[PDB]
Amino acid sequence: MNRKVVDTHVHLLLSKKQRVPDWAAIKRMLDVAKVDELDALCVTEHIEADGYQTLMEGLFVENRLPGGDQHAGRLTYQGVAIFPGAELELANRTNVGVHTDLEGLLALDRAPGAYTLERLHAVLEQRGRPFKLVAHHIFWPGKTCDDLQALGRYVNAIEVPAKDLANAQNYVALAETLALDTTGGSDAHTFIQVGACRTAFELPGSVRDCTAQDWISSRQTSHLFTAQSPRLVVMSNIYRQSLM
Ligand SMILES: [Fe+2]
Ligand SMILES: [Fe+2]
């Protein structure tokens, strides 16, 4: 088998109240992704973010990322691919990672809680375009699910979140119960946390760069962390506290 590693949950905006992408801060995050030997990053920015539209067009449309490289509609930074995505807050207040082509992502309702899981799935199924849905940090307080039965119908993977690794067993056990794949995502909002949990998957055929579509279509995915992962999350928290 051949193997890619991707942080499937990354925020390139520090907060949803940020108007303009801070390119210097983004660069810090990609530098760390390079050091930490990630193959790719999924930008699951909060769709309701003030700066979501500017961020997404800036990255993938207006090619405005300093140091960014765009070949055949694929955005790399020093070899590290950058895949478009969105994090949505659903009607029951859970979070889902949405991985699809940029056209779809820009066409979704952006109001917090605008979709149920059922409707999100229907609307994406309605398009004739590949997509992947990931249940984010499903045991996190304020983000728990009242219907884990329906989750299994509509979602493709359970995320093992970097920020909740002390409880990783629960996420793995839930994925097993539902016969779903797992992902690892960091939910990094700063350079410090990127890659703290990551996703491994096999790409069929010859060694090549992973595309967004290759990730979307991948199955049998799993998560990866280290004993030093929790520390990344704590240091990222201290850093955010210092900025206030
Ligand atoms: Fe956030
Ligand atoms: Fe997130």
Residues less than 5 Å from ion ligand 2, measured at CB: 87, 187
Q: Tokens representing 115? A: 């979709």
* Ligand approaching nearest to the C-alpha of 51: 1
8 Å CB contact between 91 and 83:
no
Distance between Cα 205 and ligand 2 center (Å): 32
Q: What CA–CA distance (Å, rounded) separates 186 from 164?
A: 10
* Ligand approaching nearest to the C-alpha of 188: 2
Side chain identity at 185, as an amino acid letter?
G
Distance between Cα 72 and ligand 1 center (Å): 30
In Å, what resolution does this model reach? 2.0
The residue whose two tokens read 């998957």 is 201
- Residue 233 gets the label, from left (phi > 0), alpha (psi -120 to 50) or beta, of alpha
8 Å CB contact between 41 and 81:
yes
How many angstroms from the chain centroid is the CA of residue 184? 9
Distance between Cα 185 and ligand 2 center (Å): 9
Determination technique for this entry: X-ray
Torsion of CA 175, 172, 83, 14, to 10 degrees: 120
Please, is 146 exposed, middle or buried when counting C-beta atoms within 10 Å of its C-beta (0-12, 13-18, 19+)? exposed
Q: Residue 179, Cβ neighbours under 10 Å: how many?
A: 7
How many angstroms from the chain centroid is the CA of residue 187? 7
Distance between Cα 102 and ligand 2 center (Å): 18
Torsion of CA 77, 81, 84, 86, to 10 degrees: -100
Side chain identity at 156, as an amino acid letter?
N
Q: What CA–CA distance (Å, rounded) separates 156 from 103?
A: 21
Binding-site residue positions for Fe(2+): 9, 11, 46, 87, 187, 189
Q: What CA–CA distance (Å, rounded) separates 40 from 20?
A: 23
Question: Concatenated DSSP letters for 63-108?
Answer: ---TT-EESSS-EEETTEEEEEEEEEE-TTS-EEEEEE-HHHHHHS
- Please name each of the domains of the chain with its CATH number: 3-243 (3.20.20.140)
DSSP letter at 211 equals: P
* Ligand approaching nearest to the C-alpha of 95: 2
SS3 content of the chain, % helix, strand, coil (to 5): 35, 25, 40
Q: What CA–CA distance (Å, rounded) separates 180 from 188?
A: 24
DSSP letter at 210 equals: P
Counted residue by residue, the chain has a size of 244
Side chain identity at 150, as an amino acid letter?
A
8 Å CB contact between 215 and 41:
no
DSSP letter at 188 equals: B
Non-local (6+) Cβ contacts of 230 within 8 A are 162, 165, 166
Binding-site residue positions: 9, 11, 46, 87, 187, 189
Q: What is the helix (H) or strand (E) element at residue 169, kind and residue range?
A: helix 168-177
Distance between Cα 2 and ligand 1 center (Å): 32
8 Å CB contact between 67 and 77:
yes
* Ligand approaching nearest to the C-alpha of 96: 2
- Residue 23 gets the label, from left (phi > 0), alpha (psi -120 to 50) or beta, of alpha
8 Å CB contact between 136 and 92:
no
The residue whose two tokens read 């329906």 is 150
Task: Select from 117, 233, 116, 218 the least CA-distant residue to 167.
Answer: 233
Distance between Cα 80 and ligand 2 center (Å): 20
